[PDB]
UniProtKB/Swiss-Prot annotation, chain A:
Official protein name in the record: Propionyl-CoA carboxylase beta chain, mitochondrial
Region entry Acyl-CoA binding, spans: 145-178
Subunit field text: The holoenzyme is a dodecamer composed of 6 PCCA/alpha subunits and 6 PCCB/beta subunits.
Role this protein plays: This is one of the 2 subunits of the biotin-dependent propionyl-CoA carboxylase (PCC), a mitochondrial enzyme involved in the catabolism of odd chain fatty acids, branched-chain amino acids isoleucine, threonine, methionine, and valine and other metabolites. Propionyl-CoA carboxylase catalyzes the carboxylation of propionyl-CoA/propanoyl-CoA to D-methylmalonyl-CoA/(S)-methylmalonyl-CoA.
Modified residues (N6-succinyllysine): 68
Gene expressing this chain: PCCB
Domains (record comment): The beta subunit contains the carboxyl transferase (CT) domain.
Residues of the full protein shown: 181 to 360 of 539
From Swiss-Prot, chain B:
Cofactor: Mg(2+); Mn(2+); biotin
Role according to the record: This is one of the 2 subunits of the biotin-dependent propionyl-CoA carboxylase (PCC), a mitochondrial enzyme involved in the catabolism of odd chain fatty acids, branched-chain amino acids isoleucine, threonine, methionine, and valine and other metabolites. Propionyl-CoA carboxylase catalyzes the carboxylation of propionyl-CoA/propanoyl-CoA to D-methylmalonyl-CoA/(S)-methylmalonyl-CoA.
Effect of residue 104 to T: In PA-1; loss of function
Subcellular localization, as worded in the UniProt entry: Mitochondrion matrix
EC number(s) recorded for this UniProt protein: 6.4.1.3
Complex and partners: The holoenzyme is a dodecamer composed of 6 PCCA/alpha subunits and 6 PCCB/beta subunits. Interacts (via the biotin carboxylation domain) with SIRT4. Interacts with SIRT3 and SIRT5.
Disease: Propionic acidemia type I: Life-threatening disease characterized by episodic vomiting, lethargy and ketosis, neutropenia, periodic thrombocytopenia, hypogammaglobulinemia, developmental retardation, and intolerance to protein.
Source organism (scientific name): Homo sapiens
Active site: 289
Residues carrying Phosphoserine: 192
Protein name as catalogued: Propionyl-CoA carboxylase alpha chain, mitochondrial
Binding site for Mn(2+) 1: 276, 289
Gene: PCCA
Pfam families: Biotin_carb_C (PF02785), Biotin_carb_N (PF00289), Biotin_lipoyl (PF00364), CPSase_L_D2 (PF02786), PCC_BT (PF18140)
Length: 180, 668
C-alpha cells in the first residue's frame, strides 16, 4: 500500500543484493527502478524445489531467478553490477540524477561543458546507404554533457536505447532507436 | 604566370598540402576520391572533385584510365600525384603526356634510369660518389679470402654468391676470422642449397641513414638542401626524422651535397628527389640509393631552409628556373618530425587498428608547432590505406628547444577513437641516447629487445601521478555536491576535512590523504608532501596542473563509479583504481571471481543469410575488422572481430543460412 501510494510522489529505487522469494518479489515491481548484483542476487517466487515438483523440468538457482536472466531475458531488472561495492558506488552516482520529489524540478548541477560547442563528429555518422547500419550510441555520447551516459538495461531489448544524462547541468532522459 | 588548374591524384594530407599551396598561388585544385573518401578533408578543401571508384585503391587511385577521364573532364592543365600511388607509374606518365597534360614529378627517363640497381650503381661510379669495390670473382682458396681483403680494405663481409637469409654469411675484421669464416662457409654451404661459392665485399658498422634532398632545374641547374637523419624506424618505415643531423660538420655537408647534385645532373633529374647515404661510425659516407619523388620526409627540411617545396615544384614544371642559389641555403634552426599512426605500438611495434575518431584536437596553440593532417573529426581509418593520422613537426632555435616543444605537443595532442603510437614517440624523443645522438638504424631493436612496454615511472613521477589522480578524484567528488538551491529541501555540504584514499596502481596499494584549500590540493603520498594547483575544469580534454612548481598536462580518458580512472601521463595510459578508505577496507571481502575472455569465438548475432566473408584460414585479423556480413530485413549487418589474431577456420561460408548463436569464424 505504501509503495503504490508513493508512486509519482517520490522516486523509489530498489537494489537486490541477495536472494528474494515469496511476497518480497513484488516490492521491486512497484518501485521505479530495480537493480541486481551479478551471480549473487536472485529473484523468484518459488524455488527450484517447487518447480521440479510441479512440472517435469530440471532447473538450478542461477537459471530460475539469476541476475543474468532478469537483465537479459525477462526484462525485469534494469541493470546488474559486478559486486556489492561497485553496486553501491554506481547507485550513489545514479542517485545524483533524480529529484527528491515530483514537486521538484529536474536537478541542475554545476557544469563545465560549454553549452554552445559544436560537435563535428556527428555529420558523418549516418551513412548515405540505406542498408548500412550505424551505432546510435556514438550520437548519444557526443551530445550529452562531458560524454557521460547512464544506460539502462544494456542487454535487454537492444533495439531501443533508454537512459539518463545531463545537458547544461540539467538531468534529462534519452530515448532512441538502435539501427544496429 | 602559372597554371590555372591542377589536378591532384592522391588523398589525405599530401593532397591537403597541394591544395593549400595552390590556394596561396591562386590556382584552382581538383581532387579525386573513392566512394569512402568522399567526405575526407582534401575533398572538401579542393575546389572541384571527381569520384573515380570504390574503396580499394586499385580501382580508385591506381585506375589511370578513370583518372585520365577526370583530368580531361575538368580541363585540368597539370597533374601532381604526390607520392605513393602513380608517382613512379610510367604507363600513367606516358599516356598522360600523350594528351599534353603537364606532369609534375619525374619524367619517365629518370624513373627508368633508376629502375634497377645496375643503372644506379653505374651512375654512382660516373657521377663519382663512392660505391666501394668488392671482389669481382669467386673466392676459392683459403688464402684468397684474406689476400683480396688486404688489397681493398678492412671490414670485410663473407656471403654466398647467390642467396640470402644467412646463407653462410659471417662478419669479419681481421685475417684470422676472415680465413675461418670462408672455409666454414665453403665446406658447409654445399649442404644447404647445393652452392658453396663465396664472395667478399666491404661493410660498415652501426650505420646511420642520412638523406640529402636535391631540387633539379629544367635548365640544367640543381641545388642541394640540408640533410635529414632518418634512423628511428620500424618494419622498414621511418617514424621520426631530424633535419640538421648531428653527424655532419660544414665541410661534410658540402662534400656530400655536391655528390648528390652530381647524381642529379648526370641523368638530368629536373625534378625534386632524395639521395640516400649510409655513414659508418668513422664518418665515411657511402651511396645507397637515389629516389625520384617528393618524400614523406619533406616537411621537416622546410622548417630550417625556409622553402616551400610544392610551390617550387609547380613553378619548375611550368618552366621557370630555380629562384635560389646555393649560397642562400642554410640551417635556420632545428626541426624534428614525428609520424603518428593508428597503430598499437605494443603488438610487435605497430599493428594497425581500425576505427572512427570521436575526439581530435591538434596542438596548434603551442609555439613552434606545425601539424600536417589529412583528417578531421568524424573520420574513419580503415584497412584499405596506410593508417596515417598526422605528421607532427616541431622546430626551434636549438636542439633542446625543438625536442622540448615536441614533448609538449605530444602531450597536448588529443587522439581518441583509435589506438595510436604517441606513447612510443613520447618516450623515444626523451631517451638519453636520442638526446645525445647515439642513434643507429637499429636503435629501437636494441632499446626494446622484448617489445614496447610503455614509459617507466621513477619515484618522483609516481608521486606526482598519484597526487594528480587523487586530487582529480576529489575534484569530481566536490563538483558532485554543488547543486542549485532548492527552496523546499536545503542541501547541506558535507564538512569533510580530509579525504583518505586507497590508490591502487599496477600491483601496489598506496596511502594518500588529500585536502582542498581552494584551487590547490595538499596531498600526502605515502609520507611525501605534494601541492597540486589547477583550475580543475573537468570538461576539457586537456587538464593542466602544477605539481610543486612542475608543469604537467594530463588527460582523463575514462572514469567509473567503481574507482577506475584512466589517465594519460607522459604519453602512457595508466590505470588507477581509487577507493575511499572505507570502500577499500570492505572490498577485501569480495570474491575474486575469474571470468572467461570469449573474444576469439565469433558467432552470428542475428539470423539471416551470410553474403560475404572477408577471410580464409591464415588471414590476419585486427580488432574491429569486418569478418562476415549477414543481411536480414533489408539491412547489412557487419560482424567484426574482438581480438587481434589470425583465422584458424571459417565455419560458415557466403550463401549459407545461419541462426542466432551459430559459429561463423574461429580466431586464434
Amino acid at each position: 500500500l505504501r509503495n503504490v501510494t508513493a508512486s509519482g510522489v517520490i522516486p523509489q529505487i530498489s537494489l537486490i543484493m541477495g536472494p528474494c522469494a515469496g511476497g518480497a518479489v513484488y516490492s521491486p515491481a512497484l518501485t521505479d527502478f530495480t537493480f541486481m548484483v551479478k551471480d549473487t542476487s536472485y529473484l523468484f517466487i518459488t524455488g527450484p524445489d517447487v518447480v521440479k515438483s510441479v512440472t517435469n523440468e530440471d532447473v538450478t538457482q542461477e537459471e530460475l531467478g539469476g541476475a543474468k536472466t532478469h537483465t537479459t531475458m525477462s526484462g525485469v531488472a534494469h541493470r546488474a553490477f559486478e559486486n556489492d561495492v561497485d553496486a553501491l558506488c554506481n547507485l550513489r552516482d545514479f542517485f545524483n540524477y533524480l529529484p527528491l520529489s515530483s514537486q521538484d524540478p529536474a536537478p541542475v548541477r554545476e557544469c563545465h561543458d560549454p553549452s554552445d560547442r559544436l560537435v563535428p563528429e556527428l555529420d558523418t555518422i549516418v551513412p548515405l546507404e540505406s542498408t548500412k547500419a550505424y551505432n546510435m550510441v556514438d550520437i548519444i555520447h557526443s551530445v550529452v554533457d562531458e560524454r557521460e551516459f547512464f544506460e539502462i538495461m544494456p542487454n535487454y531489448a537492444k533495439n531501443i536505447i533508454v537512459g539518463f544524462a545531463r545537458m547544461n547541468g540539467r538531468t534529462v532522459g534519452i530515448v532512441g532507436n538502435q539501427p544496429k | 604566370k602559372t597554371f590555372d588548374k591542377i589536378l591532384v591524384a592522391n588523398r589525405g594530407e599530401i593532397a591537403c598540402r597541394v591544395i593549400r599551396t595552390c590556394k596561396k598561388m591562386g590556382i584552382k585544385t581538383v581532387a579525386i576520391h573513392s566512394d569512402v573518401d568522399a567526405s575526407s578533408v582534401h575533398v572538401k578543401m579542393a575546389d572541384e572533385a571527381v569520384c573515380v571508384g570504390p574503396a580499394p585503391t586499385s580501382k580508385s587511385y591506381l585506375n589511370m584510365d578513370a583518372i585520365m577521364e577526370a583530368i580531361k573532364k575538368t580541363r585540368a592543365q597539370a597533374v601532381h600525384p604526390g607520392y605513393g600511388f602513380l608517382s613512379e607509374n610510367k604507363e600513367f606518365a606516358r599516356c598522360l603526356a600523350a594528351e599534353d597534360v603537364v606532369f609534375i614529378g619525374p619524367d619517365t627517363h629518370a624513373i627508368q634510369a633508376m629502375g634497377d640497381k645496375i643503372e644506379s650503381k653505374l651512375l654512382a661510379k660516373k657521377a663519382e660518389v663512392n660505391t666501394i669495390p668488392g671482389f669481382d670473382g669467386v673466392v676459392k682458396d683459403a688464402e684468397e679470402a684474406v689476400r683480396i681483403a688486404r688489397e681493398i680494405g678492412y671490414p670485410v663481409m663473407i656471403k654466398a654468391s647467390a642467396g640470402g637469409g644467412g646463407k653462410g654469411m659471417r662478419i669479419a675484421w681481421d685475417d684470422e676470422e676472415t680465413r675461418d669464416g670462408f672455409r666454414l662457409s665453403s665446406q658447409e654451404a654445399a649442404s644447404s642449397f647445393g652452392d658453396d661459392r663465396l664472395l667478399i665485399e666491404k661493410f660498415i658498422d652501426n650505420p646511420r641513414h642520412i638523406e640529402i634532398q636535391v631540387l633539379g632545374d629544367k635548365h640544367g641547374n640543381a641545388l642541394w638542401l640540408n640533410e635529414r637523419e632518418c634512423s628511428i624506424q620500424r618494419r622498414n618505415q621511418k617514424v621520426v626524422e631530424e633535419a640538421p643531423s648531428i653527424f655532419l660538420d660544414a665541410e661534410t655537408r658540402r662534400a656530400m651535397g655536391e655528390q648528390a647534385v652530381a647524381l642529379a645532373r648526370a641523368v638530368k633529374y629536373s625534378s625534386a628527389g632524395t639521395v640516400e647515404f649510409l655513414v659508418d661510425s668513422k664518418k665515411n659516407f657511402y651511396f645507397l640509393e637515389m629516389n625520384t619523388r617528393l618524400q614523406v620526409e619533406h616537411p621537416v627540411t622546410e622548417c630550417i631552409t625556409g622553402l616551400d617545396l610544392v610551390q617550387e615544384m609547380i613553378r619548375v614544371a611550368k618552366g621557370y628556373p630555380l629562384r635560389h642559389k646555393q649560397a642562400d641555403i642554410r640551417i635556420n634552426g632545428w626541426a624534428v618530425e614525428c609520424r603518428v599512426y593508428a597503430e598499437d605500438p605494443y603488438k610487435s611495434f605497430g599493428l594497425p587498428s581500425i576505427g572512427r575518431l570521436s575526439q581530435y584536437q591538434e596542438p596548434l596553440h603551442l609555439p613552434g608547432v606545425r601539424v600536417d593532417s589529412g583528417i578531421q573529426p568524424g573520420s574513419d581509418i580503415s584497412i584499405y590505406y596506410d593508417p596515417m593520422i598526422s605528421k607532427l613537426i616541431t622546430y626551434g632555435s636549438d636542439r633542446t628547444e625543438a625536442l622540448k616543444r615536441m614533448a609538449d605537443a605530444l602531450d597536448n595532442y588529443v587522439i581518441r577513437g583509435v589506438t595510436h603510437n604517441i606513447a612510443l614517440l613520447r618516450e623515444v624523443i626523451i631517451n638519453s641516447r636520442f638526446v645525445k645522438g647515439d642513434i643507429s638504424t637499429k636503435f629501437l631493436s636494441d632499446v626494446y629487445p622484448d617489445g614496447f612496454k610503455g614509459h617507466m615511472l621513477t619515484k618522483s613521477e609516481k608521486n606526482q601521478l598519484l597526487a594528480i589522480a587523487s586530487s582529480l578524484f576529489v575534484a569530481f567528488q566536490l563538483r558532485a555536491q554543488h547543486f542549485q538551491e532548492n527552496s523546499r529541501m536545503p542541501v547541506i555540504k558535507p564538512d569533510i576535512a580530509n579525504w583518505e584514499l586507497s590508490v591502487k596502481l599496477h600491483d601496489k596499494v598506496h596511502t594518500v590523504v588529500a585536502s582542498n584549500n581552494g584551487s590547490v590540493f595538499s596531498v600526502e603520498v605515502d609520507g611525501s608532501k605534494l601541492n597540486v594547483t589547477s583550475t580543475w575544469n573537468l570538461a576539457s580534454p586537456l587538464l593542466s596542473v602544477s605539481v610543486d612548481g612542475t608543469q604537467r598536462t594530463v588527460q582523463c580518458l575514462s572514469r567509473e563509479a567503481g574507482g577506475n580512472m584512466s589517465i594519460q601521463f607522459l604519453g602512457t595510459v595508466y590505470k588507477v583504481n581509487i577507493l575511499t578508505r572505507l570502500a577499500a577496507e570492505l572490498n577485501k571481502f569480495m570474491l575474486e571471481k575469474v571470468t572467461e575472455d570469449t573474444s576469439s569465438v565469433l558467432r552470428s548475432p542475428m539470423p539471416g543469410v551470410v553474403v560475404a566473408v572477408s577471410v580464409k584460414p591464415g588471414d590476419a585479423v585486427a580488432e574491429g575488422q569486418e569478418i562476415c556480413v549477414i543481411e536480414a530485413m533489408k539491412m547489412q549487418n557487419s560482424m567484426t572481430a574482438g581480438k587481434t589474431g589470425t583465422v584458424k577456420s571459417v565455419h560458415c561460408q557466403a550463401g549459407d543460412t545461419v541462426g542466432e548463436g551459430d559459429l561463423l569464424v574461429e580466431l586464434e
